[PDB]
C-alpha cells in the first residue's frame, strides 16, 4: 500500500517504539508466541517470536493477504538477534515480467537452491545481535537474471528477536545511519 | 457364432483367438546379384471374432537383408473366409498373392473339430538365397 | 478324573446357496471362500490362462453376443476409412 | 504328442499337437447304515485287504457290498492331476522315499478311503489317503506325497452330473480327496475353482440312489461309504 | 524400441508391480513360464512386448523390472509364486533387514548398503535397453523403505541417467485412513525427492480406490489385490500408447510435457473408467461420452481429492479400445460446457487426448469386466493443495511435540531436515496457490 | 530376521515353556524336534526361533535362567521341554531367595557371565539377528534382578537389536510376595533404560480374562501362560509368515514409541471365546476389533477408560480385507476420539499376516501404549513408599552390598516415568 | 427388517421356546442349527429371526430372561434348547418371589444391566432392526415386573423400532395366584405407557379353544404356547415370506392404533379343528374368515360381541385369490356391522402372504383392536380394588422399596384405559 508514499533514504516497516507496532503485521501463531519483551543485551524492548515449528509461527506484512506492499527500495535491512534456534525469513517481490517471485533464507538450509518461483538460501548468523543487509535487485539478477521492481510481502518466521526492519535505497554506514536506527 | 461356440464348449469369446497360418509370397528380382526369384515368408493371423487378417513378415536366416515386422495391418480383406483359408491355396490381399501352405496346431485342431480335414504342410520353395 | 498336574472337514468345496453362488463370482469373494488356507499372492496371482476366459463365473453356456463381430474397431479398419472403399466401389 | 514345426519357416511353432487318449479308472463301493467305531482303523484294514466284515467293526451288515463306479478321465487336459488320480487308484507312489504320517507309514491309495463329506444335491467328497486319523483331516497328501500339485485347466463347466474333481484347499493346491458333483445346478459354485478330473459313466443311478441323497448341509455323512478296491482299466464284472 | 524400465520399491510397490506384470503378461499372451505358447497365437502385435519384455535367444521374454525391497518376505513370496520363471533370479533384490517404517533408516543406514547393487541392476537393464523411454517407479511414500530407499534410488537415477523421464505412480497417505503413525513424516520427507528428482508424480492414495471398488464394483470385501488390479489397469492404460499402435500415440515425454506446467508442479490427479463388475457390465450403454463424464465426475477417480475444490490445469486423457475421436471431442465439448469443472485462466486448451486401439484385457479371477472401451485421466490441478494441506497439518501436529523424531534422528538424519520438509511443503502449497491465482 | 529368546525365573521359565509349546504346535514340530506340519509355509521362516541340527532336529533359540534348579528341571522335562538345548540350562546352586539384590549383585552376577556366553553363542549362530525377547516377572527375585542385569549387558553388547521384554507386573490383588514392590521399583528403571520395548503383564488381568472372557471354572497358571503365549507368537507372526501388510519388531516399535521412555505397552488379544459359545459366536473382523478394544479382554490391569492412547498396534492374522482392517480402526478413532490423543493422527498402526493361528479363521493381537498404564506403576510406587518409609525389609537388600540411595533413585525414576505419561495424557495441541 | 425376541418369566420362556419351535419348523431348521428346507424362500428371509455364525449355525435372535434359574434349564431341555446362544441365558440366584415389586425394583434392576448389554449387542448385530418383541405373563413377578422394566429401557434406547409384546392376562376362573391383580395392575399401565401394541393372552381363552375347537382331552401349557406361537409367527409371516399384499409390525400398528393409548389387541388363529371335524370340514377362505371372526376362536377372554371393533387385521397365508380376501371381510363388515364403529369405515386391514405354514395349504391370523378388550381389565381392576381397599398383600410390595402411590397411579391409568375403551364404543358420530 506504499505505492502512493515517498520511498527514499529509509522506510521502516517494523519497530518496537510504537504502542501497537504490528499495525500492518498479521501474527499467524501456532504452538508458539509473539510478544513484546525486554532484551538484556540492549536493555530495550524488542519483538520475541517463538514456536516449536518454525513454519507455523510467523508474522506477515501486510496483514491482509490480498493487499501487497509497494516499497521500491531494493535494500532490506534487519536488526535480529540469533538465539541458535531454527529461524527463517521470506521476501516476496515483483519482477519486470509482472509475476511475483520469492526469496527465502533459513538457518537450517544446506545449499542455495533455485526454483521457478522460490529461491531458498541458507544463513549463518553470528552470536548475539546481528544487522543484515539484503540487496533485492542483486539477488534477483543473480538467481533469475531478472529485473527488480518492488516488494510485495515481508515475512519473518518463529525463533527471532526483531528490533528494526527497514528498506533503504543504498548502503548506509553506521555514521550516516540515523540514531533511532542504530542499536 | 452359435455353432462355433456349440462345437467348442470351453470357449467363451473369440477375442484374441486368431488362427496362425504360415505362407510365402514370391517376386521376380531382376537387378540383383545372386537371386533372380525371391521368396518372402509371412505369418497370417486370422482373428475369427472380427473376421480380420493380418500379415507379418518373418525372415529365415540372420543375414536376410529384409526388414522383420508387420507389413500388413489387421483388417478385413475382400472375399476371404475360413473356407478360403486352406493349405496349398492362394490368398490375394493388398495386391499380393500369398501361397498358403502351412498352419499351426491350434488352427489344425480347429479345422478338424469343424469337420474339414486340414492337410499336412507340403514344402517351402527353395529360392537361390536359401542355398547360400 | 482331573488333576492339577475339531472333527470337521476344512477343505473346499462346501455348500454355497443359490444367491451365494451368484454373489461369490466377484462380490464377497473373501467371505465365500470357505477354506483357502494359503497366502494372498498364491491365492490371487495364479496362472491366468487356466482360469475361465470371462471375468467371474459365466451364467451358463457361452453367449454369442459376448463376442464382437463389427470390423470397425479394427486398427487397419480405422486406418482406412469407409468412404475410401466407397470410392473404390464407385 | 507334439511335433515341432518347420524351423526354416522363421518362427518356432507347433505343427501337430495330439491330445492323449482318455483313460479309465474303476472303484468298488461298500455302503454301511452305521459307521465303524474307528473309521481310520477300518480304512487301514480295508487298505491292507482284510475281510470287510471283520475290518469294519460296528458298521454292521453292508447294505450293498459291490457298487462299481467307472470313471473316464479327461487326460487331454489333466496330465499331472489325472496321472495322480490313476496312481492313487492303483496304489502306486510317485516318490521313492516313504511317506510317514502320525508315526505310521501310509501307502497312497483309495483302497481304504471313505466318503466323508456328502452334501445332498451338491456333491460327495472322499478319498483321504490319510484315513482321517487326525480329527480335522488333511488334503496335503497325494501320490507324490508332501506335495500340492498345481491346478490345471479349470475351464471345464460343471453342467453334467457325476463329474469327479480334486476338492482343493484353494488354487494350486490339489491332493488326494476328490468330490463327485451330484447335481446339475452347482456349476456356479464349482466353476473356476476346481479342476474337472473326470466323469463317471457307469454306476450313476446307484450312486444317485444309495450314496448321494443322504447327508446334510454341513456334509456330515449319514452312511459309511467306502472304496474297498480301486484300480485302472475297466471295472470287473 | 520405446522401452521403459519398471522399478518397484517397498511392499506396496512390489504388489503393484505384481499386478501390473500379470496384466502385461495377459496383454502380450506371455505365460507365467516367461514364453509365449507355440500352440496358441494371441496376435496382439509383432513387438508390443518389446517395451516391457526383453527377448532372449531361446524365445523367452523377461520383464524389464526391478523389485527392490529392503525385507525378504515379499520378494521371497514372489520367488515362490507362480511367476518364478517369468521373473529373473536377479532384478528381484531382497534386503536382509527391513527399513522399519523410517525414512531415515531407509535413506541413511540401510539405503546405502543396497543402492549400489540396485543401480548395478538398473545399469544391467539400461545397457540392454536401446531406446529407453524412461523409468516407471512404483512405491508408497508412507512406508519406510518405499520412501527412503525410493528417494535414494530416484536421485541416484537422476544424477546417473541425466534427463530421462521419471514417472512415480506413488501411493500417498490417505486423507482419513492410514496404516502407520510416522506415515505423515515419511510422506513429507519423501516429498523432497518426489519434487526435485521426479518428472511426474501420480497420486494413488487409498480411500479413493477403496470406495471406487466399494460402489462401482459392489464388492463388500475388496483388498490390496483389487486395489493393485485397478492400479495396474491404470498403468496399462497409460502405457498402451507407447506399447501398441494408436490413433494419437503419446509417449512418456509426449504427455509429461503437456501435463507439467512448472518444474515443481507435477503431482497429478488419477481417474479410470469404466470400472464395472460383470453383473452390471452387460447392461449399460458404455459410450465414450458416458465414460468421459464418469471420469470427470468427482466420484469415480483413483485419488481421493475433489476437483471442484480446486482449479483444473491440464488433463491428459488416454482412451483405449474402439474409441472414436469425434466421440472424444464431443465429450470434451460437453464437459467444457459443463460449469461444474473449471480450468485455470492461463491454460485455455488444457486437454491432451490420446487414443489407442487395443481395449483393456480381461484379468480372469479379478473384478474388472470385459469392456470394449475405456479411458484414464491424468489431470494436473490445484486440487492437490488441500490434500497436501492435510498432510502437512498432520506433520505439524506430530512435529509440535517432537514425537517420533528420535527414531529418525538416531538413524542419521539431522533435526533440521524435518524443518526442510515442512518448508518445502509450504513452498509447494503456496506455489499451487500462485499458479491458481487469477491474473 | 530372527529373534532369540531368554526366560528368567520360575514365572519367565513357564511363560517361555508355553510360548515354545504354542510355537512348536503352530510350526508343526513335535517334542522330539521333527517336523510334521500341515503347510509348506511352516518351514519358510522356522529359522526365526528354531536352529536346525546335523540330524534335522529343531532346537529353540532359548536361553534359560534361574538360580533354583527345580523350575529348571520342570522346564527341562515338560511336555515340550525336550526341545531346548541342554547347555542353555544355566542354573545355580542356591536360589535367589526372592531378592532383587541377590539376583542382581551377588549371586546372579557370578552366574551372568555364563548366560552372556550362551546368548552370544546363540546370537552369532544367527544370520541376521533381529534381537532378543526376554520373559520374566518383576515380582520375583531372579526374574527381576538378573533379568534386568542381562538386559543391561545386552544393551551394552548389541545396541541396535530389538530388546523386547515381557515383564509380569505384580499386583496387590494377586500378591503372594511381600517384596514385590521392592523388586518392581528396582527393576522398572532398568527396564526403562535397557529395553527397546516392554510389555507389562498382570496376573489379575489374566485371571479376570479367564473367569469372564473364557468362562473357565478352574483357571491355572498354565492357562495364563497359554494366554500370554497367544500374543508372544502373534507379535512375530508377521516376521514368520507372509501377509498383505507385514511388519516386524522395529516396524511396530517405531509406530508405538513416540518418545524413548514411552515403551511400556498394554497387552490385548482376540478372539477369546468360551468352550460352549465357540460354535455360536460369528468370528467377524468387526467382532475381533470390538473385543480387542474392549477393556475386559485386555490382559493389562490398567483400565483404558482412565487414559489416552499414545499409540496402538493391531497385528491381525487370517484371510481378511483391508476395508475392515482400516475402516474399523478409523471408526474406533472417530467414536473414541476422547480416548485418543489429538496431536497423533490415526493413533492405530495396522499389520496383516495372512497365515492365522491354528484352529482360528482369524485373530488379532493388540499392543497399546495407552497413558492409563501409569496407574499400576502408581500403586506399586505407593506400596513401595509405604514399605520404605519405615525402611522395612531393607536389611536383606543392604546386606548384599547394595546402597540405600538406590531405592530412592528407583522411586525417582518410577515417578518420572509416571509424570512422563501424565504430561502426554493431558498434553494439548 | 429384523425382530429380536426376548422371553421373560416361566410363562414367557415356555411361550418363546414353543414359538422358536414353530419358527424353526417353518424355516426348516434342525435343533443343531442347520438348514435343510426344500425351498429357497426359507433362506431368503431366514435372517429375520436368526443370525448365521461362522460355522453356518443359525442362532435365534432371542434373549432368555428369568429370576429363577430352574426354568433356564427347562428351556434348554426343550426340543430347541441348544439352538439359543449360551450367553443370552441370563438369570438370577433367587426368583422374583411372585412379586412385581422385587421383579421391577430390587432384583430385576440389579440384573437389567446385563440384559440391556445383551439386547444392545443383538440389536446392533442386525442390519436394520424392525424392532423388539417380548413374551411374558403379567400375573407373575418376573414376566410382569422385569419384563416391563426391559420394555421401559428399550423404549428409552430404541424408540423408533417397533416393540411387539405378548402379555398373558390372568383370569379369576383360571387363576392360580393371589397377587395376580396386583401384578397385572402394576404392569398394565407400564404396557400402556411403553408398549407399541400389546395384545393379550388368557389361559382361559386358550383352554376353551383347546376343549371346544380342538376337542383336546388333556390340554397342557405346551398346547397353550403352541396356540400363542400360532399368532406369534402369523404376525410376521409377511415379513418372512413374499406375498401378494405385504405388511409388517409397523404397518399393523399404524393401521390398528387409532389413538396412542389404544394399542391392546385381541387375536385368533384359523384353521383350527379337532380330529373328527377335520375330515368333515371343508377348507376355504370363507371358512377361514368365519372361524377367525367367530367368538370361540379367540385367545382373549372377553367376547367380541360385547365390544366394538376399532380396527381389525387379517393376515392370510397361502395361495388364494384376492376376491375372497376382499369380499369375505366385506361380508363380515356389512352383515354384523355392529362390531365396527361408524366414524372409521373399512375397518379391516388385509394382507396376503404366498407361503402358508408347512403342512397347511391355507391359514390366517387375526389381530383386533376391539373395545371389548377392557372387560378382563375391569375384572382384574375389581379384584385389585377388593385387595387394595384393605391393604391386602401390600407389605410385600412396600417392603421392596415401592410405595402405595404407585398402586394408586396404576389404578388411575387402569381406569383411564378402561374408560377410553368403553366410551369410544358408544360415542356418537
Ligand atoms: N495401493 C496399494 N497400497 C498398499 C499396498 N500394500 C501396502 N500399501 C500401502 O503402502 C504403504 C507403505 O507400505 P508399508 O506397509 O510401509 O511397507 P514398506 O513400503 O515395505 O515399508 P516397511 O513397512 O518399513 O517395510 C502402507 O502404509 C500401505 O497403506 C497395496 O498392495 N496396494
Ligand atoms: N502368568 C503366570 N504367572 C506366574 C507363573 N508362575 C509364577 N507366576 C507369578 O510370579 C510370581 C512369583 O514369581 P517367582 O516365581 O517367585 O519369580 P522368581 O523368584 O524370579 O523365580 C507370582 O506372584 C505369580 O503370580 C506362570 O506360570 N504364569
Ligand atoms: N399359556 C401358558 N401360561 C403359563 C405358562 N406357564 C405359566 N403360565 C401362566 O402364568 C401364571 C404364572 O406366571 P409365572 O410363570 O409364575 O410368571 P413369572 O413369575 O414371570 O415366571 C399361571 O397362572 C399360569 O397360568 C405356559 O407355559 N403357557
Ligand atoms: Mg515392508
TrEMBL record, chain A:
<protein>
    <recommendedName>
        <fullName>CFA20 domain-containing protein</fullName>
    </recommendedName>
</protein>
<dbReference type="Pfam" id="PF05018">
    <property type="entry name" value="CFA20_dom"/>
</dbReference>
<feature type="domain" description="CFA20">
    <location>
        <begin position="1"/>
        <end position="183"/>
    </location>
</feature>
<dbReference type="InterPro" id="IPR007714">
    <property type="entry name" value="CFA20_dom"/>
</dbReference>
<dbReference type="InterPro" id="IPR040441">
    <property type="entry name" value="CFA20/CFAP20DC"/>
</dbReference>
Automatic annotation (TrEMBL), chain B:
<protein>
    <recommendedName>
        <fullName>Rib72 protein-like protein</fullName>
    </recommendedName>
</protein>
<feature type="domain" description="DM10">
    <location>
        <begin position="15"/>
        <end position="115"/>
    </location>
</feature>
Automatic annotation (TrEMBL), chain E:
<dbReference type="InterPro" id="IPR018316">
    <property type="entry name" value="Tubulin/FtsZ_2-layer-sand-dom"/>
</dbReference>
<dbReference type="GO" id="GO:0005525">
    <property type="term" value="F:GTP binding"/>
</dbReference>
<dbReference type="GO" id="GO:0005874">
    <property type="term" value="C:microtubule"/>
</dbReference>
<dbReference type="GO" id="GO:0005200">
    <property type="term" value="F:structural constituent of cytoskeleton"/>
</dbReference>
<dbReference type="InterPro" id="IPR037103">
    <property type="entry name" value="Tubulin/FtsZ-like_C"/>
</dbReference>
<comment type="similarity">
    <text>Belongs to the tubulin family.</text>
</comment>
<keyword id="KW-0378">Hydrolase</keyword>
<dbReference type="InterPro" id="IPR023123">
    <property type="entry name" value="Tubulin_C"/>
</dbReference>
<comment type="subunit">
    <text>Dimer of alpha and beta chains. A typical microtubule is a hollow water-filled tube with an outer diameter of 25 nm and an inner diameter of 15 nM. Alpha-beta heterodimers associate head-to-tail to form protofilaments running lengthwise along the microtubule wall with the beta-tubulin subunit facing the microtubule plus end conferring a structural polarity. Microtubules usually have 13 protofilaments but different protofilament numbers can be found in some organisms and specialized cells.</text>
</comment>
<dbReference type="InterPro" id="IPR003008">
    <property type="entry name" value="Tubulin_FtsZ_GTPase"/>
</dbReference>
<comment type="function">
    <text>Tubulin is the major constituent of microtubules, a cylinder consisting of laterally associated linear protofilaments composed of alpha- and beta-tubulin heterodimers. Microtubules grow by the addition of GTP-tubulin dimers to the microtubule end, where a stabilizing cap forms. Below the cap, tubulin dimers are in GDP-bound state, owing to GTPase activity of alpha-tubulin.</text>
</comment>
<keyword id="KW-0342">GTP-binding</keyword>
UniProtKB/TrEMBL annotation, chains F, G:
<keyword id="KW-0479">Metal-binding</keyword>
<comment type="subunit">
    <text>Dimer of alpha and beta chains. A typical microtubule is a hollow water-filled tube with an outer diameter of 25 nm and an inner diameter of 15 nM. Alpha-beta heterodimers associate head-to-tail to form protofilaments running lengthwise along the microtubule wall with the beta-tubulin subunit facing the microtubule plus end conferring a structural polarity. Microtubules usually have 13 protofilaments but different protofilament numbers can be found in some organisms and specialized cells.</text>
</comment>
<comment type="similarity">
    <text>Belongs to the tubulin family.</text>
</comment>
<dbReference type="GO" id="GO:0005200">
    <property type="term" value="F:structural constituent of cytoskeleton"/>
</dbReference>
<keyword id="KW-0460">Magnesium</keyword>
<keyword id="KW-0206">Cytoskeleton</keyword>
<protein>
    <recommendedName>
        <fullName>Tubulin beta chain</fullName>
    </recommendedName>
</protein>
<keyword id="KW-0547">Nucleotide-binding</keyword>
<comment type="function">
    <text>Tubulin is the major constituent of microtubules, a cylinder consisting of laterally associated linear protofilaments composed of alpha- and beta-tubulin heterodimers. Microtubules grow by the addition of GTP-tubulin dimers to the microtubule end, where a stabilizing cap forms. Below the cap, tubulin dimers are in GDP-bound state, owing to GTPase activity of alpha-tubulin.</text>
</comment>
<dbReference type="GO" id="GO:0003924">
    <property type="term" value="F:GTPase activity"/>
</dbReference>
<dbReference type="GO" id="GO:0007017">
    <property type="term" value="P:microtubule-based process"/>
</dbReference>
<dbReference type="GO" id="GO:0005874">
    <property type="term" value="C:microtubule"/>
</dbReference>
